[PDB]
Amino acid sequence: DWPVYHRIDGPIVMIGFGSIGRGTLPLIERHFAFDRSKLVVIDPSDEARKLAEARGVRFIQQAVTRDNYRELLVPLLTAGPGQGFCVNLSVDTSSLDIMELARENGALYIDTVVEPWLGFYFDPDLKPEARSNYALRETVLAARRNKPGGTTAVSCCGANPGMVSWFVKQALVNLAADLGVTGEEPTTREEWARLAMDLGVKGIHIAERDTQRASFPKPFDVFVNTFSVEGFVSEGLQPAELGWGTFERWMPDNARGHDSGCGAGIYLLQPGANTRVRSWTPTAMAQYGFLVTHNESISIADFLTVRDAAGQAVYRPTCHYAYHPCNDAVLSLHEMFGSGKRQSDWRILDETEIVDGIDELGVLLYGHGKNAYWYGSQLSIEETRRIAPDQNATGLQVSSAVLAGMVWALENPNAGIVEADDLDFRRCLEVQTPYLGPVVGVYTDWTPLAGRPGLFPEDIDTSDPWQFRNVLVRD
Amino acid sequence: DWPVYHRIDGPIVMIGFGSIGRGTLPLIERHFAFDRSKLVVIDPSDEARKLAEARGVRFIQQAVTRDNYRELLVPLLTAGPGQGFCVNLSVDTSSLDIMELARENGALYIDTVVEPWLGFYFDPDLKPEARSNYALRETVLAARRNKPGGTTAVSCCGANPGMVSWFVKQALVNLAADLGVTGEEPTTREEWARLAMDLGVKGIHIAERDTQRASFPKPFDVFVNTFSVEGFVSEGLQPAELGWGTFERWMPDNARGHDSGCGAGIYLLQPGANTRVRSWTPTAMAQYGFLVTHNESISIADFLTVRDAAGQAVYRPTCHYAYHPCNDAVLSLHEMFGSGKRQSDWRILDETEIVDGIDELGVLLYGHGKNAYWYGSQLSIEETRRIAPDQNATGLQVSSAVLAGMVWALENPNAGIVEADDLDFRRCLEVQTPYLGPVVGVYTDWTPLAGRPGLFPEDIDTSDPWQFRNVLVRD
Ligand SMILES: NC(=O)c1ccc[n+]([C@@H]2O[C@H](COP(=O)([O-])OP(=O)(O)OC[C@H]3O[C@@H](n4cnc5c(N)ncnc54)[C@H](O)[C@@H]3O)[C@@H](O)[C@H]2O)c1
Ligand SMILES: NC(=O)c1ccc[n+]([C@@H]2O[C@H](COP(=O)([O-])OP(=O)(O)OC[C@H]3O[C@@H](n4cnc5c(N)ncnc54)[C@H](O)[C@@H]3O)[C@@H](O)[C@H]2O)c1
């Protein structure tokens, strides 16, 4: 008795059939009506081909490249009779170029990252700033300015970026209610931004702890993760990056801003997966997270910016990832950065290989009158296995978020290029929540200055515990 | 047919019966002749009591403290008929005070660390310099000056500090042959220092990689290690510390020296178990180690110091620990520092819980004509079980070193206060080698600049790859 949300009146082209594609395909088949032969999967991998053949879906074993993407995707997306849907869950392909092609041809589009064409991330002719997610996001914002309106294309609608934007909205509404502030839920961007300002939210961590454990010990010289290894390593080697709040009064010497764009970002001249921050989640309590760059770090800070009449920002929250991956990924990062190079092999943990654990993923709003508030999902691998096949808990949070964005795009098909912060957060969470396990809000009195200073001198700001000065792990 | 080296006619007083005591006692019973009833074990824990009772050995369930150690230990050391042997394998006791008591009463003494009385490691009034192993070692050096000669007391004779001092001497001999350096084998401290200078040894890593894996996944909120958790955490929270070589051109801003003493060391105003360094071992290849303070970092650099007539140091190698512990300890450190406090529970892995792996422990001599040379032990858990009971591979490298130090002290019982660098390294390795598994020398062309600079600017010294400026990892 699963709900069927909408009929798709055209081709469904899934680009990429890795961990997320494999988890999303069953949800698409479950929740949408369409003729079976309308759906086709594109992935160059032989392992992906064999899995698709076993599931009985059409499969085209090809890499989408800058050279072929028009000749390949335009016929597939315009096969008729009506509007198709491009579901982009790949690596090494330009989200912007495919998004623009889909829009030119009237097809809906969704992805989970602003990915560039193969060769971008390690091109030595690029300055660190050009490798930032801020710069990639600005290409999408410029595309929206150049062609406002038109067919809906949802950028960066996964678990994070994606779902966490909806959690921020629900958390802000919950904070206001827990303070006795009633009525008038925000409906415009400026109203959301002023709610965060008015409640005194200084910053937001994307506070995640993955406790999924494997049935085999970590193999030497193998990178192990619960989702894309190539994707995670690629983003881990990008500069550490954060949305930068107006309350901050210190940044590292190797921090830099941007000459252009929305104004909400800084980056550090060091890899994010080797940069630690002090953070907190309900199950982990105090923990280190890695400051891996993510689209929502910028987009959430941008969304919640209040400007004056002159257009200058007067309020903006800090926002960044504080990611504690599964234990085998922690070991994998230690191995990779300690050897100076990528391991010779890698593997993504299948649900059949996971003995227990959860993916605790939420937002940590701090600086307000109740200090810190964590809101998000505590989905376990055991619950995952009972409600959705072919994925672990990490994957289900992502694939259910793509499902939600697809429902929203089908229900709002003339909205133009949108981010997760632009969607109806209540409708999206209504679609996604059956796949999120426990969704809870927890207050804590912890701050980054708990237990500090210790036995060594430290550079801290005791008048403001949540300053980045105190969060960043430094010598 | 294990060799029985000597008969011990006096009391054998073992202070502490933890992981090392439990591995050393069977070796003492195997390799020395004596009546079992002259053994006495002192330990405050019930777990130790039951283990000692299971071996039918006399047990005293007491913590040795500053308030009771004289009245508790003097009768035991002087019970006769022969000369006593105090084997100190404890935590929370003063190595110096117990050592001086033993010498005062004509009893031999051996320990594996310069330990202070309980309370020192976390006294909030102590300046960081006073919490350094340099300072603790200076208390032993002063005792030797104040009372030269006399009954032999062996300070810091475990695997590291201890065995690695003998590896350094053998490695210097191997390097001299391979580099064509001619001359008689050195037989005095000055001649060893001169050999290291003449070979161009810029520095030495105590380069260790523990690959022992457990049969169960790491539990949350449990520190897991292959030896003393309390001792490892205590030394991990002391300042990072190293012997400081004359070739070094740079030290970090938070580095500090010493106004008095042998002059061979610096320390950093940060905990050593959260300080990473770039290093290398044969099985690990390039890896991160932690810069945990160790007595041998100072003692080896001091031993290999060449002075001019004025008394000023003209050559000294850098020397420090570069320790990659077992995977569960790596996770335990990330957990402990990430939370800001010790875990609620801890456990030491038993040989029955270890499924495979080795304790690769050696010395990496670098800066010479063949770049870098690693010499040491690759003892596996499988070999350990075949040759010695009640311990893992980490433990056996330590207990066999205590055995070797005991044999040397019996054959040299009036040598005064001595460090491992002062013992006859060939005789000690003759006793220890049956318990070390493969002992190999390996050259490598790896340097700390391999693959650098990369995607980001780095504060490196391209003129000399082995500078500490290139080894230390900045966060
Ligand atoms: N927003 C989020 O929450 C979130 C979470 C996880 C992953 N992601 C992103 O989703 C994407 C997929 O993650 P994943 O775990 O499935 O990764 P994955 O590595 O498992 O799978 C990637 C797939 O892309 C395919 N591929 C490679 N080059 C291709 C090309 N040129 N054309 C088509 N396909 C190609 C590969 O064969 C592979 O099957 C990644 O880009 C990742 O960054 C987003
Ligand atoms: N040099 C080396 O290679 C090396 C290697 C490992 C350990 N060590 C050192 O050896 C020592 C023993 O290590 P371990 O692994 O056996 O430690 P452990 O923690 O396993 O055991 C310590 C024992 O000391 C006992 N103890 C505590 N307080 C005491 C007191 N006041 N008097 C007497 N006993 C007391 C405890 O009850 C326990 O049984 C530690 O100090 C450690 O730092 C040296």
Residue numbers in the entry:
A (entry chain B), B (entry chain A): 3 to 477
The study reports:
Bacterial HSS is mostly found in α-proteobacteria and in some β- and γ-proteobacteria, including pathogenic strains such as Legionella pneumophila, Brucella spp. and various P. aeruginosa strains, including PA7 and PA14. It catalyzes the conversion of two molecules of putrescine (PUT; 1,4-diaminobutane) into one molecule of sym-homospermidine [HSP; bis(4-aminobutyl)amine] as the main reaction along with several side reactions. The cofactor NAD+ is bound as a prosthetic group in the binding pocket with its nicotinamide ring being part of the active site.
To experimentally substantiate this interaction, the tryptophan residue was exchanged for residues with reduced aromatic character (W229F, W229Y and W229H), for both acidic (W229E) and basic (W229K) residues and for alanine (W229A). Except for the W229F and W229Y variants, which retained very low activity (∼2% and 1% of the wild-type activity, respectively), all other variants were inactive. In conclusion, the decreased or abolished activity should be caused by the exchange of Trp229 and not by structural perturbation of the binding pocket. In the W229F variant, the location of the Phe229 phenyl ring is distinctly defined by the electron-density distribution. In conclusion, we suggest the weaker cation–π interaction in the W229F and W229Y variants to be the reason for their reduced activities as explained in the following. Firstly, the Phe229 benzene moiety is shifted in relation to the Trp229 benzene moiety and therefore also in relation to the ‘center amino site’.
